[PDB]
Every structure is written in C-alpha cells, then in structure tokens.
C-alpha cells in the first residue's frame, strides 16, 4: 500500500481564498480573490510535489519548472475533484470561501472556461473515479508538460513519469479477471488526463491576457503569480513547453 500511503498522506488540506463573500460579486473582486487563491494553492503544490516519491532525483531547477508548468492543470484537477466531492459538480469549488455559482462564472468573465472545468468535474462522477485513481492521476499530471527542448536532466524525469504511469496502471478500478475491463479503464483515465491540458491552456491564455490588462482593471496579481504568468506561461502558449499527451491531438 506504500505508494498510495504516500499520496493520501501528503494530499494537501483545505486552502481558503480569503474571499469576502459578504460584498457585491464583481469581476475585480472575483479575480483578485482567485489570484490570491492561485498564489496559496501554488505554495501547497510546491510542498506537495517535493514530498512526492522520487521527486528529488530531478535537478533543482527542473523541479521548480515542472511545478511551474504543471501548476494550473493540477489546481484545476484538484479543484474539479473538490467540486465533485463537495457539491456534486453543480458549482466550482475553488475554496470553501470561494464557490462559483453560474452568476459568479459570468461575473468572473470565465464562463467559457468554467464550463469546461465543470465538465471535467462531472467526468469524475460519470467515470466513478476512485479517490485513489484521482491521486495517482493528479501526481501524474505533475509530470505531463515539459520544454520540447528537454529538461536540465531528462533521464530522471522519464524514469519518474514511467514509474508514475506504472503506479496508476496497478490501481485502476477494474476486473483483473477480465482483459477488456482494465484495458478499457486505462483508456478512459488517460483520456481524462489528456482532457485536462486544453483546459489548462485556456486558463493560461486568460490569466496571461488578464495579467497584461491588470494595471487597467485593478485586479491584484501576487509576487509569484506575475512571475510565473509572465515568464513560464508564455513558453507554454508559444509552443516551447508542451504537454505530454497519451493520445494524439
């Protein structure tokens, strides 16, 4: 049980946004609160990642980058799970103090993207994704997007990803006395992982675009946000850093 012992043991607790629920819903407040939530969620992903099995084989700057490139898809992924498990995918459960209803979806101007993220949530229920399946997939997300140019030491990354792909394959919810079953379960879960990437890309696009006009619209971006968004995110949007897909796109 050792691998999943780890994952569950290091799975972060509740991160609040700091949001002031008892004021008017508005774009500037909704998005200033998400940027503080993203900033906090980051700090936790950092410690979560660093405690992952085998993670510190990676070169130190690879570690940071990997985290930076994966940070949005992971947040989104875990977010969707919170929304699955807390509200049964009706609303987006960013935080206990930041739960997006339809109305906030519109006011945040992220309706198109919230829709996708919510669809994602619903897949968890449709597919009856087990909590165990969720953690393994989420851990695997960390290792699903790299510079095409390669990492400072790619050898150890491939070894981890391979090993993390292996661990998910053991734990899939399936009839082991039936070929088609586990075969089928894997395919589904791989597709689901793949489906996280286009959504992350949309959020990147939006946050980046948003950052550029942040001075105008007075949406506050934290230290590490602006650092990531202006430096790492554009590499992804420029096609320098690409997601590792299971299936061809």
Nearer to ligand 77T, 167 or 202 (CB): 202
Nearer to ligand 77T, 62 or 197 (CB): 197
CB of 229 to ligand 77T, least distance (A): 8
Q: Which two tokens stand for residue 92?
A: 């987006």
Q: How far is the CB of 222 from ligand 77T (least distance, A)?
A: 10
Phi, psi for residue 222 in degrees, rounded to 5: -60, 170
How many whole angstroms separate alpha carbon 155 and alpha carbon 135? 24
Q: Which is nearer to ligand 77T, 30 or 172 (CB)?
A: 30
- CB of residue 246 to ligand 77T, shortest distance in Å: 22
Nearest distance from C-beta of residue 184 to ligand 77T, angstroms? 29
Q: Is the distance from CB of 69 to CB of 241 less than 8 angstroms? A: yes
Annotated binding site for 17beta-hydroxy-5alpha-androstan-3-one: 35, 82, 207
Output 80 or 139, the one with its CB closest to ligand 77T. 80
Cβ at position 36, least distance to ligand 77T in Å: 8
Q: Which residues does the annotation place in the binding site? A: 35, 82, 207
Closest CB to ligand 77T among 103 and 148?
103
- Residues of this chain that interact with ligand 77T (CB under 6 A) are 31, 34-35, 37-38, 41, 75-76, 79, 94, 203, 206-207
Q: Which residue is associated with the tokens 């939530």?
A: 37
How far does the chain reach from its first CA to its final CA, in angstroms?
35
- Residue among 15, 123, 101, 6 nearest 53 (CA): 6
C-alpha 123/C-alpha 85 separation (Å) is 12
Cα–Cα distance between 103 and 125 in angstroms, integer?
23
| Dist CA 30 CA 106 (whole Å) | 10
Candidates 89, 66, 188, 199; CA nearest to 139 is 66
């Amino acid at each position: 049980p050792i691998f999943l012992n780890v994952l569950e043991a290091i799975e972060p607790g509740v991160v609040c946004a700091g949001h002031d629920n008892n004021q008017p819903d508005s774009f500037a407040a909704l998005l200033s609160s998400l940027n503080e939530l993203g900033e906090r969620q980051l700090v936790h992903v950092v410690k979560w990642a660093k405690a992952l099995p085998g993670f510190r084989n990676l070169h130190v700057d690879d570690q940071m980058a990997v985290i930076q490139y994966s940070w949005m898809g992971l947040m989104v992924f875990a977010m969707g799970w919170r929304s699955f498990t807390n509200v049964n995918s009706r609303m987006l459960y960013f935080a206990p103090d930041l739960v997006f209803n339809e109305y906030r979806m519109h006011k945040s101007r992220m309706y198109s993207q919230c829709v996708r993220m919510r669809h994602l949530s619903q897949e968890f229920g449709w597919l009856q994704i087990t909590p165990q399946e969720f953690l393994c997939m989420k851990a695997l997300l960390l290792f699903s997007i790299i510079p095409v140019d390669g990492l400072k030491n790619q050898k150890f990354f491939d070894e981890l990803r391979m090993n993390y792909i292996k661990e998910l394959d053991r734990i899939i919810a399936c009839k082991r006395k039936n070929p088609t079953s586990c075969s089928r379960r894997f395919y589904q879960l791989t597709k689901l992982l793949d489906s996280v990437q286009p959504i992350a890309r949309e959020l990147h696009q939006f946050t980046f675009d948003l950052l550029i006009k942040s001075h105008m619209v007075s949406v506050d971006f934290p230290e590490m946000m602006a650092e990531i968004i202006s430096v790492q995110v554009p590499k992804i949007l420029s096609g320098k850093v690409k997601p590792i897909y299971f299936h061809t796109q």
